Amino acid sequence: KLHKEPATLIKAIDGDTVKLMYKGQPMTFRLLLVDTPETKHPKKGVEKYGPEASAFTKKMVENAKKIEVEFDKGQRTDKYGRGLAYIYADGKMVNEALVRQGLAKVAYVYKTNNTHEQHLRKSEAQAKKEKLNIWS
């Protein structure tokens, strides 16, 4: 059973990355199970839908009154020291909102952290079906 913990927005970095104050310390969080187009792609510049996926995440966390983080059952940090979690803004999962809007693809790359994989897969199909953004 997963559980949500409070956090405070510090700043939105990218479509898939946000800096939050968590248990009194600043931490960078990488959104579990999604891959958004990058704006800070180490190699490829600004990918198509990057600006849009970034604006989307930023808007959602910046306008929330409450942000919560939910770790999965596997490892909690990646090799870069980023927290791996599902982020909620006023009870809405950011992870799902992105996929539903066709601003992210379902990744899945830490076999243990899969609690919401199916849920996300269904939203991605719907976004595909509606040919939105990425799927357009």
PDB file of C-alpha atoms in Angstrom:
ATOM      1  CA  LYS A   1       0.000   0.000   0.000  1.00  0.00           C
ATOM      2  CA  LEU A   2       1.482   3.283  -1.214  1.00  0.00           C
ATOM      3  CA  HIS A   3       0.976   6.521   0.744  1.00  0.00           C
ATOM      4  CA  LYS A   4       1.124  10.204  -0.177  1.00  0.00           C
ATOM      5  CA  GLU A   5       3.428  12.542   1.730  1.00  0.00           C
ATOM      6  CA  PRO A   6       3.331  16.350   1.580  1.00  0.00           C
ATOM      7  CA  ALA A   7       5.992  18.369  -0.236  1.00  0.00           C
ATOM      8  CA  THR A   8       6.417  22.001  -1.165  1.00  0.00           C
ATOM      9  CA  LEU A   9       7.197  23.192  -4.653  1.00  0.00           C
ATOM     10  CA  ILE A  10      10.607  24.796  -5.037  1.00  0.00           C
ATOM     11  CA  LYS A  11      10.551  24.988  -8.878  1.00  0.00           C
ATOM     12  CA  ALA A  12       9.501  23.057 -12.000  1.00  0.00           C
ATOM     13  CA  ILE A  13      12.517  22.108 -14.116  1.00  0.00           C
ATOM     14  CA  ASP A  14      11.234  20.128 -17.084  1.00  0.00           C
ATOM     15  CA  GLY A  15       8.137  18.226 -18.138  1.00  0.00           C
ATOM     16  CA  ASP A  16       9.411  15.210 -16.101  1.00  0.00           C
ATOM     17  CA  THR A  17      11.467  16.823 -13.320  1.00  0.00           C
ATOM     18  CA  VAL A  18      10.526  19.096 -10.389  1.00  0.00           C
ATOM     19  CA  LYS A  19      12.492  20.324  -7.353  1.00  0.00           C
ATOM     20  CA  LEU A  20      10.550  20.003  -4.112  1.00  0.00           C
ATOM     21  CA  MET A  21      11.221  20.518  -0.400  1.00  0.00           C
ATOM     22  CA  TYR A  22      10.686  17.014   1.044  1.00  0.00           C
ATOM     23  CA  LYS A  23      11.030  16.199   4.735  1.00  0.00           C
ATOM     24  CA  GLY A  24      12.681  19.568   5.181  1.00  0.00           C
ATOM     25  CA  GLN A  25      15.220  19.169   2.385  1.00  0.00           C
ATOM     26  CA  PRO A  26      15.368  20.236  -1.250  1.00  0.00           C
ATOM     27  CA  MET A  27      15.239  17.212  -3.580  1.00  0.00           C
ATOM     28  CA  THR A  28      14.909  16.811  -7.323  1.00  0.00           C
ATOM     29  CA  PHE A  29      12.171  14.369  -8.273  1.00  0.00           C
ATOM     30  CA  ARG A  30      11.931  12.460 -11.513  1.00  0.00           C
ATOM     31  CA  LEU A  31       8.315  11.525 -12.404  1.00  0.00           C
ATOM     32  CA  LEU A  32       7.835   7.738 -12.344  1.00  0.00           C
ATOM     33  CA  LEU A  33       6.763   5.896 -15.499  1.00  0.00           C
ATOM     34  CA  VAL A  34       6.624   8.768 -17.985  1.00  0.00           C
ATOM     35  CA  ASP A  35       8.921  10.159 -20.633  1.00  0.00           C
ATOM     36  CA  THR A  36       8.198  13.721 -21.770  1.00  0.00           C
ATOM     37  CA  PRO A  37      10.021  15.454 -24.662  1.00  0.00           C
ATOM     38  CA  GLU A  38      13.059  17.297 -23.285  1.00  0.00           C
ATOM     39  CA  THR A  39      13.995  20.936 -23.364  1.00  0.00           C
ATOM     40  CA  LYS A  40      17.337  20.083 -21.723  1.00  0.00           C
ATOM     41  CA  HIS A  41      18.062  17.035 -23.840  1.00  0.00           C
ATOM     42  CA  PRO A  42      21.762  16.319 -23.263  1.00  0.00           C
ATOM     43  CA  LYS A  43      22.136  15.763 -27.005  1.00  0.00           C
ATOM     44  CA  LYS A  44      19.090  16.692 -29.078  1.00  0.00           C
ATOM     45  CA  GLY A  45      18.243  20.322 -28.145  1.00  0.00           C
ATOM     46  CA  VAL A  46      14.550  21.042 -27.603  1.00  0.00           C
ATOM     47  CA  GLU A  47      12.349  18.141 -28.694  1.00  0.00           C
ATOM     48  CA  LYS A  48       8.929  18.689 -30.241  1.00  0.00           C
ATOM     49  CA  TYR A  49       6.358  19.035 -27.430  1.00  0.00           C
ATOM     50  CA  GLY A  50       9.122  19.765 -24.903  1.00  0.00           C
ATOM     51  CA  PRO A  51       8.079  23.375 -24.262  1.00  0.00           C
ATOM     52  CA  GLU A  52       4.475  22.235 -24.122  1.00  0.00           C
ATOM     53  CA  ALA A  53       5.138  19.329 -21.685  1.00  0.00           C
ATOM     54  CA  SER A  54       7.209  21.706 -19.525  1.00  0.00           C
ATOM     55  CA  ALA A  55       4.540  24.405 -19.478  1.00  0.00           C
ATOM     56  CA  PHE A  56       2.002  21.752 -18.626  1.00  0.00           C
ATOM     57  CA  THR A  57       3.907  20.397 -15.602  1.00  0.00           C
ATOM     58  CA  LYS A  58       4.842  23.901 -14.428  1.00  0.00           C
ATOM     59  CA  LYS A  59       1.271  25.157 -14.661  1.00  0.00           C
ATOM     60  CA  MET A  60      -0.107  22.198 -12.758  1.00  0.00           C
ATOM     61  CA  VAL A  61       2.327  22.361  -9.837  1.00  0.00           C
ATOM     62  CA  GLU A  62       2.556  26.142  -9.655  1.00  0.00           C
ATOM     63  CA  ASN A  63      -1.219  26.505  -9.433  1.00  0.00           C
ATOM     64  CA  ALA A  64      -1.762  23.716  -6.857  1.00  0.00           C
ATOM     65  CA  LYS A  65      -2.601  24.429  -3.257  1.00  0.00           C
ATOM     66  CA  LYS A  66      -1.259  21.050  -2.138  1.00  0.00           C
ATOM     67  CA  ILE A  67       1.449  18.855  -3.651  1.00  0.00           C
ATOM     68  CA  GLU A  68       1.979  15.288  -2.485  1.00  0.00           C
ATOM     69  CA  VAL A  69       4.609  12.674  -3.374  1.00  0.00           C
ATOM     70  CA  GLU A  70       4.046   8.910  -3.430  1.00  0.00           C
ATOM     71  CA  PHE A  71       7.049   6.573  -3.659  1.00  0.00           C
ATOM     72  CA  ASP A  72       6.573   3.143  -5.268  1.00  0.00           C
ATOM     73  CA  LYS A  73       7.681  -0.175  -3.688  1.00  0.00           C
ATOM     74  CA  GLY A  74      11.105  -0.401  -5.363  1.00  0.00           C
ATOM     75  CA  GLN A  75      14.148   1.900  -5.220  1.00  0.00           C
ATOM     76  CA  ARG A  76      13.343   5.469  -4.320  1.00  0.00           C
ATOM     77  CA  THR A  77      16.226   7.316  -5.970  1.00  0.00           C
ATOM     78  CA  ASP A  78      17.906   6.948  -9.383  1.00  0.00           C
ATOM     79  CA  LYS A  79      21.661   6.880  -9.975  1.00  0.00           C
ATOM     80  CA  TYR A  80      21.617  10.689 -10.290  1.00  0.00           C
ATOM     81  CA  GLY A  81      20.164  11.010  -6.786  1.00  0.00           C
ATOM     82  CA  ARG A  82      16.665  12.049  -7.996  1.00  0.00           C
ATOM     83  CA  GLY A  83      13.596  10.780  -6.045  1.00  0.00           C
ATOM     84  CA  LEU A  84      11.380   8.462  -8.129  1.00  0.00           C
ATOM     85  CA  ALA A  85       7.731   9.137  -7.405  1.00  0.00           C
ATOM     86  CA  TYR A  86       4.229   9.871  -8.577  1.00  0.00           C
ATOM     87  CA  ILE A  87       3.455  13.565  -7.899  1.00  0.00           C
ATOM     88  CA  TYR A  88      -0.054  14.818  -7.111  1.00  0.00           C
ATOM     89  CA  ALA A  89      -1.348  18.413  -7.439  1.00  0.00           C
ATOM     90  CA  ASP A  90      -4.579  18.982  -5.543  1.00  0.00           C
ATOM     91  CA  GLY A  91      -5.094  15.255  -5.637  1.00  0.00           C
ATOM     92  CA  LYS A  92      -4.545  14.953  -9.403  1.00  0.00           C
ATOM     93  CA  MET A  93      -1.524  12.812 -10.497  1.00  0.00           C
ATOM     94  CA  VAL A  94       0.775  14.892 -12.718  1.00  0.00           C
ATOM     95  CA  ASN A  95       2.194  11.668 -14.116  1.00  0.00           C
ATOM     96  CA  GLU A  96      -1.245  10.694 -15.482  1.00  0.00           C
ATOM     97  CA  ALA A  97      -2.316  14.172 -16.632  1.00  0.00           C
ATOM     98  CA  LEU A  98       0.755  14.349 -18.958  1.00  0.00           C
ATOM     99  CA  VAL A  99       0.085  10.947 -20.577  1.00  0.00           C
ATOM    100  CA  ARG A 100      -3.648  11.629 -20.859  1.00  0.00           C
ATOM    101  CA  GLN A 101      -2.921  14.885 -22.735  1.00  0.00           C
ATOM    102  CA  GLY A 102      -0.437  13.167 -25.060  1.00  0.00           C
ATOM    103  CA  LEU A 103       2.487  15.104 -23.572  1.00  0.00           C
ATOM    104  CA  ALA A 104       4.340  11.978 -22.350  1.00  0.00           C
ATOM    105  CA  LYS A 105       4.822   8.317 -23.298  1.00  0.00           C
ATOM    106  CA  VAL A 106       4.699   5.487 -20.750  1.00  0.00           C
ATOM    107  CA  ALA A 107       8.278   4.531 -19.975  1.00  0.00           C
ATOM    108  CA  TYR A 108       8.530   1.750 -17.359  1.00  0.00           C
ATOM    109  CA  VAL A 109      12.239   1.255 -16.577  1.00  0.00           C
ATOM    110  CA  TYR A 110      12.536   0.119 -12.943  1.00  0.00           C
ATOM    111  CA  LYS A 111      10.647  -3.163 -12.898  1.00  0.00           C
ATOM    112  CA  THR A 112       9.787  -2.869  -9.186  1.00  0.00           C
ATOM    113  CA  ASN A 113       8.240   0.619  -9.432  1.00  0.00           C
ATOM    114  CA  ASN A 114       5.152  -0.372 -11.432  1.00  0.00           C
ATOM    115  CA  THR A 115       2.258   0.145  -9.109  1.00  0.00           C
ATOM    116  CA  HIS A 116       0.452   2.487 -11.575  1.00  0.00           C
ATOM    117  CA  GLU A 117       1.732   1.149 -14.888  1.00  0.00           C
ATOM    118  CA  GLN A 118      -1.650  -0.198 -16.060  1.00  0.00           C
ATOM    119  CA  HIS A 119      -3.521   2.936 -15.111  1.00  0.00           C
ATOM    120  CA  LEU A 120      -1.030   4.952 -17.138  1.00  0.00           C
ATOM    121  CA  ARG A 121      -1.154   2.539 -20.058  1.00  0.00           C
ATOM    122  CA  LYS A 122      -4.945   3.068 -20.329  1.00  0.00           C
ATOM    123  CA  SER A 123      -4.597   6.877 -20.417  1.00  0.00           C
ATOM    124  CA  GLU A 124      -1.861   6.666 -23.045  1.00  0.00           C
ATOM    125  CA  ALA A 125      -4.106   4.522 -25.295  1.00  0.00           C
ATOM    126  CA  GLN A 126      -6.868   7.097 -24.954  1.00  0.00           C
ATOM    127  CA  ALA A 127      -4.439   9.872 -25.895  1.00  0.00           C
ATOM    128  CA  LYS A 128      -3.336   7.749 -28.845  1.00  0.00           C
ATOM    129  CA  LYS A 129      -6.960   7.112 -29.814  1.00  0.00           C
ATOM    130  CA  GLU A 130      -7.638  10.881 -29.763  1.00  0.00           C
ATOM    131  CA  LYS A 131      -4.445  11.618 -31.642  1.00  0.00           C
ATOM    132  CA  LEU A 132      -3.290  14.321 -29.226  1.00  0.00           C
ATOM    133  CA  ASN A 133       0.036  16.235 -29.319  1.00  0.00           C
ATOM    134  CA  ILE A 134       2.689  13.529 -29.398  1.00  0.00           C
ATOM    135  CA  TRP A 135       0.170  11.150 -31.044  1.00  0.00           C
ATOM    136  CA  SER A 136      -0.722  13.712 -33.730  1.00  0.00           C
TER     137      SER A 136
END
